[PDB]
């Protein structure tokens, strides 16, 4: 098993912590959803290769420009997250997160991930977003942004139902293995 490091970045409400928790337990917590994620070393076998994937969160570091880059050294894959119920989090991807991740992690593959895909057809979400002339992010708007920032790929998931979660982490493992 080779050792690889993954780091998840994105706005405070992109659902990055929930995504790391649901993947690491293979379960959406049925009693208490933890506020924070410490770290985890996932045993993943992708396309016949065994890998130890260390997982890290940047939640809590968004306002601290000198503390935040200390999470970046020797990162093999970046998961750049946005929430599908929040078009404003998708807007912060190219001018805030992408230049920072390209400076501290040059040549590291970035997977752009649309979290909370279960909210795309949620009535409460569609009603709330319409009050500010907005709507849930469309899959093609996610693909266009991923193409625009030079992302390795574009993926969607729902931490709530677990759909697409395993696929994101297996693809991240494949990306971390490439030259």
């Amino acid at each position: 098993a080779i050792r690889k490091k993954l780091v998840i970045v994105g706005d405070g409400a992109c659902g990055k912590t929930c995504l790391l928790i649901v993947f690491s337990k293979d379960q959406f917590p049925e009693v208490y959803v933890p506020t924070v994620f410490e770290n985890y070393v996932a045993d993943i076998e992708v396309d016949g290769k065994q890998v130890e994937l260390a997982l890290w969160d940047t939640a809590g570091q968004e306002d601290y420009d000198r503390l935040r880059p200390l999470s970046y050294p020797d990162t093999d894959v970046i998961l750049m997250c946005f929430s599908i119920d929040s078009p404003d989090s998708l807007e912060n991807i190219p001018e805030k997160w992408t230049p920072e991740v390209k400076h501290f992690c040059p040549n590291v593959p970035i997977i752009l991930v649309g979290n909370k895909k279960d909210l795309r057809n949620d009535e409460h979400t569609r009603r709330e977003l319409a009050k500010m002339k907005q709507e849930p992010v469309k899959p093609e708007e996610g693909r266009d942004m991923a193409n625009r920032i030079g992302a390795f790929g574009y993926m969607e998931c729902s931490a709530k139902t677990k759909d697409g979660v395993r696929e994101v982490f297996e693809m991240a493992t494949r990306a971390a293995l490439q030259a």
């Binding site: 601290y64 503390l67 200390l70």
Partner: protein
């Protein structure tokens, strides 16, 4: 870490830690408040355990088995004794608060009603000055510590065998040298998220809501001061 505290914080939540007959007696909002306070203490216990792995397993093992020069070991583990002192004291105060709140006849059933005051004391005055000074020094030495570790692992055979030996047990899976350093750097920025969520479920007593509000402001002032005092050193 000690068996008593590990067993007391083994469950995934305060709701699963207490007896179910004790849980039934509380309102849902109290259970939600208690679950977040329990997560704060449980992660503080893990953080102190991370610091003990760094001082007793890594640092002390390198001094006594590899006979490594103290200047090199200090470069790998900057401020670990001071960090250990700050967080063991904070943890002792948190666990004493839980202990006083225990029901007679029980070692698991408790409700913590007055956390705000303890958080104001920890993040104000001399203890806040010591946290700011210690984390500004630690986080400025973080990159140099990782580079020094990588250089030693790739050039010294005895160092590589020592690392492979002490990190082999399954209980050290998440706690390699570099993992410990980042776990410590990230700890301070976890506090505002935990405090804000405790505050969200602490509106029942107005004085506790005010105390948690002041504590949250104190933690943010600390974080802003540490962030402004960091510059990566390079060897």
């Amino acid at each position: 870490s000690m068996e008593m505290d590990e067993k007391d914080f083994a469950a995934d939540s305060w709701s699963l830690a207490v007896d179910s007959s004790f849980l039934q007696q509380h309102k849902k909002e109290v259970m939600k408040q208690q679950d977040v306070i329990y997560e704060l203490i449980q992660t503080e216990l893990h953080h102190v355990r991370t610091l003990k792995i760094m001082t007793r397993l890594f640092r002390t093992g390198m001094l006594e088995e590899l006979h490594l020069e103290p200047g090199v070991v200090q470069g790998l583990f900057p401020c670990v004794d001071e960090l250990s002192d700050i967080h063991t004291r904070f943890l002792s105060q948190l666990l004493e608060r839980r202990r006083q709140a225990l029901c007679p006849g029980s070692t698991r059933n408790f409700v913590i009603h007055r956390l705000g005051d303890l958080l104001i004391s920890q993040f104000s005055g001399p203890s806040a000055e010591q946290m700011c000074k210690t984390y500004s020094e630690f986080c400025s030495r973080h990159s140099k510590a990782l580079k020094l570790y990588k250089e030693l692992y790739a050039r010294d055979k005895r160092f590589q065998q020592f690392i492979r030996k002490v990190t082999r047990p399954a209980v050290l899976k998440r706690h390699g040298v570099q993992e410990c350093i980042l776990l410590v750097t990230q700890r301070i920025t976890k506090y505002p998220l935990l405090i804000s969520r405790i505050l969200q479920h602490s509106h029942g007593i107005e004085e506790e809501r005010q105390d948690l509000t002041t504590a949250l402001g104190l933690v943010k002032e600390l974080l802003s001061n540490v962030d402004e005092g960091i510059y990566q050193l390079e060897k």
